Amino acid sequence: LGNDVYAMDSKIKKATGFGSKSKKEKIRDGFEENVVQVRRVTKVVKGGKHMRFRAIVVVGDKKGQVGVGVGKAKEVVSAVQKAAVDARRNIITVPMTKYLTFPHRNEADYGAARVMLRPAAPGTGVIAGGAVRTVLEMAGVENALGKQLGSNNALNNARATIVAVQTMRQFSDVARDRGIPMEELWK
Amino acid sequence: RYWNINLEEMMEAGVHFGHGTRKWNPRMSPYISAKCKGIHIINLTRTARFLSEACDLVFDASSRGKQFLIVGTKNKAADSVARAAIRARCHYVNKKWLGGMLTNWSTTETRLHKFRDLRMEQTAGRLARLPKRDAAVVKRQLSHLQTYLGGIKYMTGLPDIVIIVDQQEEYTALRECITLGIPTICLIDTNCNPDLADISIPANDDAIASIRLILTKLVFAICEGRSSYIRNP
Amino acid sequence: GQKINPLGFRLGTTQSHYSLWFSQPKNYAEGLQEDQKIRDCIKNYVQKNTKTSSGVEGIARIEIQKRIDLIQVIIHMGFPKLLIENRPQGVEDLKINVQKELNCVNRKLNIAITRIAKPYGDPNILAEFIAGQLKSRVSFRKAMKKAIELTEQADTKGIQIQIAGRIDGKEIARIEWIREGRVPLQTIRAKIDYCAYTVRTIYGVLGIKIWIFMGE
RNA sequence: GUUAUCCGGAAUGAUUGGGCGUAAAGCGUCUGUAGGUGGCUUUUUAAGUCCGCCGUCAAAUCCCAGGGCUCAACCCUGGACAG
RNA sequence: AGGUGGUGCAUGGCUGUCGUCAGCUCGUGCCGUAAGGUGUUGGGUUAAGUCCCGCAACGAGCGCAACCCUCGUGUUUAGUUGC
Ligand SMILES: [Mg+2]
Ligand SMILES: [Mg+2]
Ligand SMILES: [Mg+2]
Ligand SMILES: [Mg+2]
Ligand SMILES: [Mg+2]
Ligand SMILES: [Mg+2]
Ligand SMILES: [Mg+2]
Ligand SMILES: [Mg+2]
Ligand SMILES: [Mg+2]
Ligand SMILES: [Mg+2]
Ligand SMILES: [Mg+2]
Ligand SMILES: [Mg+2]
Ligand SMILES: [Mg+2]
Ligand SMILES: [Mg+2]
Ligand SMILES: [Mg+2]
Ligand SMILES: [Mg+2]
Ligand SMILES: [Mg+2]
Ligand SMILES: [Mg+2]
Ligand SMILES: [Mg+2]
Ligand SMILES: [Mg+2]
Ligand SMILES: [Mg+2]
Ligand SMILES: [Mg+2]
Ligand SMILES: [Mg+2]
Numbered sequence: 138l139g140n141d142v143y144a145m146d147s148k149i150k151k152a153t154g155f156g157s158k159s160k161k162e163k164i165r166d167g168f169e170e171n172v173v174q175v176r177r178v179t180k181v182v183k184g185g186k187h188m189r190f191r192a193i194v195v196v197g198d199k200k201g202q203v204g205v206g207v208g209k210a211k212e213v214v215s216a217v218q219k220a221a222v223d224a225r226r227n228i229i230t231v232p233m234t235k236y237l238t239f240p241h242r243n244e245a246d247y248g249a250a251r252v253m254l255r256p257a258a259p260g261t262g263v264i265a266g267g268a269v270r271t272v273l274e275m276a277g278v279e280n281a282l283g284k285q286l287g288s289n290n291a292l293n294n295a296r297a298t299i300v301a302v303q304t305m306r307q308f309s310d311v312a313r314d315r316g317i318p319m320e321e322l323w324k
Numbered sequence: 325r326y327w328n329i330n331l332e333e334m335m336e337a338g339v340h341f342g343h344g345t346r347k348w349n350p351r352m353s354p355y356i357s358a359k360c361k362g363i364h365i366i367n368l369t370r371t372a373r374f375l376s377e378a379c380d381l382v383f384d385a386s387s388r389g390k391q392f393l394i395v396g397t398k399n400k401a402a403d404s405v406a407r408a409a410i411r412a413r414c415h416y417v418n419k420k421w422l423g424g425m426l427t428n429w430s431t432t433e434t435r436l437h438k439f440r441d442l443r444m445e446q447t448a449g450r451l452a453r454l455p456k457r458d459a460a461v462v463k464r465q466l467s468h469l470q471t472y473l474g475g476i477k478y479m480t481g482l483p484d485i486v487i488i489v490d491q492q493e494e495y496t497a498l499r500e501c502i503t504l505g506i507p508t509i510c511l512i513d514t515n516c517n518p519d520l521a522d523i524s525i526p527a528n529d530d531a532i533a534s535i536r537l538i539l540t541k542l543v544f545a546i547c548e549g550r551s552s553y554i555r556n557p
Numbered sequence: 558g559q560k561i562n563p564l565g566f567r568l569g570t571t572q573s574h575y576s577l578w579f580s581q582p583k584n585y586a587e588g589l590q591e592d593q594k595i596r597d598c599i600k601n602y603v604q605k606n607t608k609t610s611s612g613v614e615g616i617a618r619i620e621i622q623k624r625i626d627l628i629q630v631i632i633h634m635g636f637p638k639l640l641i642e643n644r645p646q647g648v649e650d651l652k653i654n655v656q657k658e659l660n661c662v663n664r665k666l667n668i669a670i671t672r673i674a675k676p677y678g679d680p681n682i683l684a685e686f687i688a689g690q691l692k693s694r695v696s697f698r699k700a701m702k703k704a705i706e707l708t709e710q711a712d713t714k715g716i717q718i719q720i721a722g723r724i725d726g727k728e729i730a731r732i733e734w735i736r737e738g739r740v741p742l743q744t745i746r747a748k749i750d751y752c753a754y755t756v757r758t759i760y761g762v763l764g765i766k767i768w769i770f771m772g773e
Numbered sequence: 774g775u776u777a778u779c780c781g782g783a784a785u786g787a788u789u790g791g792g793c794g795u796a797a798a799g800c801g802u803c804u805g806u807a808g809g810u811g812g813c814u815u816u817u818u819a820a821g822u823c824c825g826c827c828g829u830c831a832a833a834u835c836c837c838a839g840g841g842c843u844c845a846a847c848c849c850u851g852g853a854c855a856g
Numbered sequence: 857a858g859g860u861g862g863u864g865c866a867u868g869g870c871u872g873u874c875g876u877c878a879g880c881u882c883g884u885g886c887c888g889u890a891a892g893g894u895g896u897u898g899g900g901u902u903a904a905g906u907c908c909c910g911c912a913a914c915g916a917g918c919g920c921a922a923c924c925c926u927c928g929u930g931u932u933u934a935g936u937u938g939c
């Protein structure tokens with residue numbers, strides 16, 4: 138057994154102080170953050186209006202990995218940042234097809250937001266509205282049809298889109314589930 | 325690899341019984357077996373398969389070099405856990421469990437920093453140069469920090485295997501490990517839902533004997549796995 | 558509410574004076590007047606001669622100690638690369654003017670320039686820095702965060718920065734402040750360096766107050 | 774560019790495609806005539822339904838394939854899914 | 857140049873006030889689709905979010921208290937202009 142002071146100062150030197158070490162590590166994560174929405178929410182106190190910013194932000198690699206996140210702070214920058222982290226720990230993967238599109242047609246429901254996605258022919262681009270379109274674009278889906286029915290709220294539509302593309306079943310897996318060869322379901 | 329289990333020893337230590345039929349969760353109805361005098365009786369042929377798979381993954385995870393926690397907060401299970409963890413040379417929680425031990429790491433670890441400074445203080449003998457209020461206060465810090473950080477105070481980094489006693493009372497452990505991507509190997513009585521753990525072993529709650537039986541089996545798996553990770557690295 | 562200039566709060570405990578002399582109650586007014594005249598001169602000279610050569614000149618403070626024979630001026634200064642490198646070194650060139658101002662009867666003057674090691678552990682220098690950047694129509698967020706950085710890599714335990722006025726030239730004035738680390742203002746044992754500074758913009762005045770806590 | 778007219782967006786009259794505890798919305802409650810739907814098994818019939826073949830649903834327009842005005846718009850030939 | 861001419865709803869500095877009232881918040885986590893919540897609430901106790909127990913919260917910051925001056929008791933030292 139080596140002394141307690143040198144080994145605990147080794148776990149103290151290995152976990153670095155937050156006041157002596159500045160932060161930008163994020164581009165080494167291989168991710169890009171896109172700010173969807175910036176709103177000023179308010180808590181009210183006996184003094185007056187206590188102002189905050191809420192940022193809804195999605196992150197993707199444009200390579201088939203995407204996530205949504207929501208954050209709150211006093212400054213635009215900080216909320217952006219929190220949103221970034223909350224998203225990064227919430228992240229999932231969208232099933233893709235050789236042509237960069239969806240396996241099939243799907244609906245989704247989150248709150249009052251309903252979302253309609255359907256696959257497209259290559260060269261149609263991504264046609265959709267703000268939340269759905271940023272989510273899908275950041276996932277890297279190249280050709281997709283989508284329409285949000287029901288409500289318009291950015292956040293809910295994002296989450297609904299995630300619910301959509303999460304339940305998407307790729308053909309290999311339905312072949313495996315049903316217990317039937319691919320070529321038989323192809324027909 | 326094999327482990328030590330038979331119908332006779334599990335019959336001995338009293339694993340097969342659990343809480344009254346007013347108190348049960350029907351979510352467990354698939355693998356329960358009988359009901360006697362309004363006292364439920366849980367299937368042991370499932371119990372052996374789960375305990376086998378549990379000691380197997382415990383052996384593979386010990387052998388690869390992964391780190392272990394064990395948890396129960398009860399009165400008897402605490403006296404059993406300090407010794408289970410000393411016998412397997414692992415990390416433990418017996419006394420009051422703090423919310424955020426796993427999930428919120430950063431603040432837990434700074435709490436460990438200051439507890440380490442306190443451990444150096446107390447052995448240095450520099451608590452004798454202080455006013456009486458200062459020594460009583462530093463002794464509050466010590467009492468608390470020993471209660472909560474007592475068994476984890478070796479561990480640096482995030483624990484990737486957690487073992488638990490009686491998930492009914494242990495809810496936050498289950499939540500935190502569900503959240504962080506950690507496996508739970510847990511004891512189930514007739515009142516608890518088999519959602520909350522990765523490998524959930526049908527077991528007994530009220531009995532110190534069942535706790536000792538299954539925990540000694542598991543700490544023996546961690547011990548032989550400890551021989552295999554003393555060898556492989 | 559109002560706080561006290563944390564300078565003034567600790568006087569004769571954790572903080573020294575600047576003018577170190579003594580005088581009989583009649584002469585006190587005169588002597589004070591003299592200190593004011595040379596502080597004025599020495600600030601003006603350095604301002605004009607350094608800001609012509611385009612640099613950031615910290616004048617951290619001016620300590621004046623009057624002795625019956627020689628009156629000595631010690632300039633705490635953050636970067637005397639601007640004052641020393643010029644051919645007529647600040648020592649002599651100021652000595653002549655500062656000795657023109659007070660008097661030479663029974664009093665001769667000595668100038669001594671001191672290098673303050675960490676320029677960003679001093680509020681006054683830092684506030685001149687933020688004054689420069691905000692005079693450059695850099696947004697105040699950037700300026701604040703740059704100051705915070707420079708200072709916390711310059712060895713500081715705590716800092717509070719306040720900026721008040723018409724910010725970004727917007728019509729309605731406001732107050733923006735950031736606290737960083739730990740800054741007790743009520744603890745007299747704590748060593749606290751405070752500084753107040755004023756800036757002239759296209760949109761009018763801007764105040765800067767800075768608190769620096771160096772420990773107990 | 775502005776104004777007018779119409780469809781869109783509008784899932785805002787909703788078959789595909791909405792609702793009705795508190796947001797607009799369940800008759801005060803039953804009995805019951807027309808009307809609509811209606812359990813299982815075997816047979817029959819073939820009205821719907823389904824498949825094949827024929828007649829026709831004019832030419833012009835729309836869709837596909839060529840041809841002609843230098844190109845295009847426009848014109849011309851041939852052919853067809855729907856229904 | 858000079859302006860004690862205009863505008864304190866264009867501003868800095870400085871101050872009053874609620875009130876020397878005990879509050880105000882933040883970081884990480886967790887609960888909520890979200891604004892937000894929790895921590896800061898419950899049982900006690902304080903002049904005090906003072907402090908202790910309990911609690912999905914764990915910590916920190918500015919406040920409070922303390923470190924400052926003056927008046928209370930003693931001891932060592934220094935004795936003129938005071939004794
Ligand atoms: Mg709905
Ligand atoms: Mg719409
Ligand atoms: Mg204030
Ligand atoms: Mg026109
Ligand atoms: Mg319509
Ligand atoms: Mg309408
Ligand atoms: Mg409606
Ligand atoms: Mg109403
Ligand atoms: Mg109504
Ligand atoms: Mg009714
Ligand atoms: Mg009614
Ligand atoms: Mg009626
Ligand atoms: Mg009827
Ligand atoms: Mg009838
Ligand atoms: Mg009929
Ligand atoms: Mg029928
Ligand atoms: Mg025709
Ligand atoms: Mg053509
Ligand atoms: Mg042609
Ligand atoms: Mg034709
Ligand atoms: Mg036909
Ligand atoms: Mg003028
Ligand atoms: Mg007014």
Ligand SMILES: [Mg+2]
């Ligand atoms: Mg929070």
Ligand SMILES: [Mg+2]
């Ligand atoms: Mg949430």
Ligand SMILES: [Mg+2]
């Ligand atoms: Mg509490």
Ligand SMILES: [Mg+2]
Binds near residue numbers: 896
């Ligand atoms: Mg409060």
Ligand SMILES: [Mg+2]
């Ligand atoms: Mg609150």
Ligand SMILES: [Mg+2]
Binds near residue numbers: 897
């Ligand atoms: Mg509450």
Ligand SMILES: [Mg+2]
Binds near residue numbers: 900
């Ligand atoms: Mg009470």
Ligand SMILES: [Mg+2]
Binds near residue numbers: 876903904
């Ligand atoms: Mg009070």
Ligand SMILES: [Mg+2]
Binds near residue numbers: 897911
């Ligand atoms: Mg609570």
Ligand SMILES: [Mg+2]
């Ligand atoms: Mg306090």
Ligand SMILES: [Mg+2]
């Ligand atoms: Mg006295």
